[PDB]
Design a protein around this ligand. Structure first.
Ligand code: NA
Ligand code: NA
Length: 151
C-alpha cells in the first residue's frame, strides 16, 4: 500500500544489458545533446529504460566521464555509436521522484545504507531514467540510482 514515500532502498541483482552507447566527457549539460544521437542510431527501438553509467563525476564542477546508454536489440547506424553489454552488478537501488541533476540526499542515503549493511560501494554507478512527463512539459520524473557493491 506504500510505494516511493522513501527512496525504496534495496540490494538488486541486475543482469547484463545490451546497450547502444556514446562515451562522453565534459559538462553534464552537454550530454543531452548526445543521448538523442544514440536513439536515432537504433531507429528509436529501445527495449529498456535509458541510463547514464558514471565513471567520473564532480557535482561541484558538474563535469564528468560517462556512457550514455539505450538498451536495444538493434545494430547502430551513423558512427560514434557502439554496442556493448553493461556488466552484471549487485547494486544498492534507490528510486528518486522529481528533479534529478544532483540528488545529494539519495547518494547520502545509499552511502549510509551501505555502512549500515556492511556493504562496500564499487563505482561506476548508474542513473536509470525510468519515467517522466516526456517532451511536452518533472515532479513526475522517476530516476533509479544503481550503485554496485563488492560481492
Ligand atoms: Na537524507
Ligand atoms: Na527523478
Amino acid at each position: 500500500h506504500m510505494a516511493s514515500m522513501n527512496y525504496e532502498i534495496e540490494v538488486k541483482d541486475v543482469e547484463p544489458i545490451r546497450v547502444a552507447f556514446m562515451h562522453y566527457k565534459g559538462p553534464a549539460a552537454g550530454a543531452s545533446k548526445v543521448m538523442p544521437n544514440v536513439f536515432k542510431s537504433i531507429q528509436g527501438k529501445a527495449n529498456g529504460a535509458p541510463f547514464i553509467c558514471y565513471y567520473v563525476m564532480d557535482q561541484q564542477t558538474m563535469t564528468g566521464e560517462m556512457d550514455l546508454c539505450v538498451p536495444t536489440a538493434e545494430n547502430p547506424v551513423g558512427n560514434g555509436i557502439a554496442v556493448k553489454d553493461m556488466p552484471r552488478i549487485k547494486a544498492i537501488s534507490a528510486t528518486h521522484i522529481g528533479p534529478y541533476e544532483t540528488m545529494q540526499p539519495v547518494y547520502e542515503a545509499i552511502e549510509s545504507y551501505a555502512r549500515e549493511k556492511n556493504l562496500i560501494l564499487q563505482p561506476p554507478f548508474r542513473e536509470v531514467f525510468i519515467k517522466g512527463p516526456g517532451m511536452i512539459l518533472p515532479n513526475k520524473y522517476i530516476t533509479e540510482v544503481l550503485f554496485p557493491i563488492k560481492e
